[PDB]
Design a protein around this ligand. Structure first.
Ligand SMILES: *[C@@H]1O[C@H](CO)[C@@H](O[C@@H]2O[C@H](CO)[C@@H](O)[C@H](O)[C@H]2NC(C)=O)[C@H](O)[C@H]1NC(C)=O
Ligand SMILES: *[C@@H]1O[C@H](CO)[C@@H](O[C@@H]2O[C@H](CO)[C@@H](O)[C@H](O)[C@H]2NC(C)=O)[C@H](O)[C@H]1NC(C)=O
Ligand SMILES: *[C@@H]1O[C@H](CO)[C@@H](O[C@@H]2O[C@H](CO)[C@@H](O)[C@H](O)[C@H]2NC(C)=O)[C@H](O)[C@H]1NC(C)=O
Lengths: 112, 50, 100, 51
């Protein structure tokens, strides 16, 4: 009878309707603060050449650089200047000047 | 401009096909000021297929 | 336009998709997780076995499963392993029925 | 070679783009701006009008 087939469609349809959701990722562009390199292909013998061959277990150790990660805050003022005294319709042709300057300590402590 | 020359041992080689205990940062771009004024193009490394 | 025809006769609800010689079952987080080298997908399921007997009244899936398992067992495991008990049926996430 | 040619094409576009947008009027205004700026405030008073 079809009742068995019908309930089986129902169970399969139900199970595939379940939420199996995953997160999105905002990937910020790397600045080059951390860099890695890869292994390279290497030429090897066409015929065996080594002597005293032996099997064995090995444990490889690397130099411990012990990275210390911490939080740092940076403060700066971006300045921009243009020839406004000629009028907005013309200042555009005379270019623009820009500079990035550090915030003096007294401003970081007494104002920020 | 040319700066200096590193030995191949100066950079951390990533293990063959799977690696762990690797340290990283949440890189923050800090774009140059000229990208807003002069609207010069920001370096984006070598081109991916995408 | 198309030529009309009477509705086709009914067919079995499920088709044999894969025959897997090596499939490891493991219990974790209150769920079974099946994995193999032949299929890169991992199948997740509840610990309860599905009551297929009261659904596959025509024994369609039953016959296909029992025959395939015996063929594989005779071909590759006959002289190296023993079968523990009767086959088990599990409804895995994604809508698959795994006979184990 | 594909990525080498792609980087050559966006360079050709930048040159064509510059040729279209490098207005001779803007070049003249830039020259006049520098001339009046060098004359100080006496230059600003006139510059604002002649512009
Ligand atoms: C860094 O290396 C250590 C081993 O030196 C890893 O430590 C294991 O971590 C798991 C998950 O917490 C534990 O179940 C194990 O008991 C740990 N092993 C030991 C010997 O303590 C650690 O996972 C690595 N960290 C990263 C981020 O890769
Ligand atoms: C599967 O394994 C069994 C042994 O576990 C094999 O049994 C033999 O069957 C023949 C025919 O009935 C008998 O003459 C032998 O005496 C049995 N041997 C043993 C050790 O009991 C069986 O042949 C195997 N099947 C296949 C298809 O290889
Ligand atoms: C595994 O078992 C759980 C119950 O422990 C089932 O979850 C229920 O599923 C139905 C049908 O989609 C829902 O209406 C209920 O709200 C669920 N209950 C809870 C407590 O979440 C689940 O369907 C089973 N999954 C499989 C693949 O067999």
């Amino acid at each position: 009878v079809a009742a068995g087939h019908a309930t089986l469609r129902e169970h399969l349809r139900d199970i595939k309707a379940e939420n199996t959701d995953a997160n999105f990722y905002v990937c910020p562009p790397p600045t080059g603060a951390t860099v890695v390199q890869f292994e390279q292909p290497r030429r090897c013998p066409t015929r065996p050449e080594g002597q005293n061959y032996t099997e064995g277990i090995a444990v490889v150790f690397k130099e411990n650089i012990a990275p210390y990660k911490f939080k740092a805050t940076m403060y700066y003022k971006d300045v921009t200047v243009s020839q406004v005294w000629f009028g907005h319709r013309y200042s555009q042709f005379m270019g623009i000047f820009e500079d990035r300057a550090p915030v003096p300590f007294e401003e970081v402590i007494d104002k920020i | 401009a040319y700066s200096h020359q590193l030995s191949r041992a100066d950079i951390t080689t990533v293990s063959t096909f799977i690696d762990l205990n690797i340290t990283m940062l949440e890189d923050h771009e800090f774009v140059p000021l000229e990208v807003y004024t002069r609207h010069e193009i920001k370096d984006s490394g070598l081109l991916d297929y995408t | 336009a198309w030529d009309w025809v009477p509705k086709r006769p009914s067919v079995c609800t499920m088709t044999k998709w894969q025959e897997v010689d090596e499939m490891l079952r493991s219990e974790y987080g209150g769920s079974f997780r099946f994995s193999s080298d032949a299929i890169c997908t991992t199948f997740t399921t509840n610990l309860t076995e599905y009551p297929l007997s009261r659904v596959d009244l025509g024994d369609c899936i039953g016959k296909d499963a029992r025959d395939a398992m015996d063929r594989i067992f005779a071909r590759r495991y006959n002289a190296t392993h023993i079968k523990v008990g009767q086959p088990q049926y599990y409804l895995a996430n994604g809508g698959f029925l795994i006979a184990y | 070679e594909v990525q080498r040619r792609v980087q050559l094409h966006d360079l050709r576009f930048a040159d064509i783009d510059t040729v279209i947008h490098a207005d001779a009027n803007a070049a003249m205004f830039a020259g006049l701006g520098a001339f009046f700026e060098g004359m100080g405030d006496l230059g600003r008073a006139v510059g604002k009008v002649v512009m």
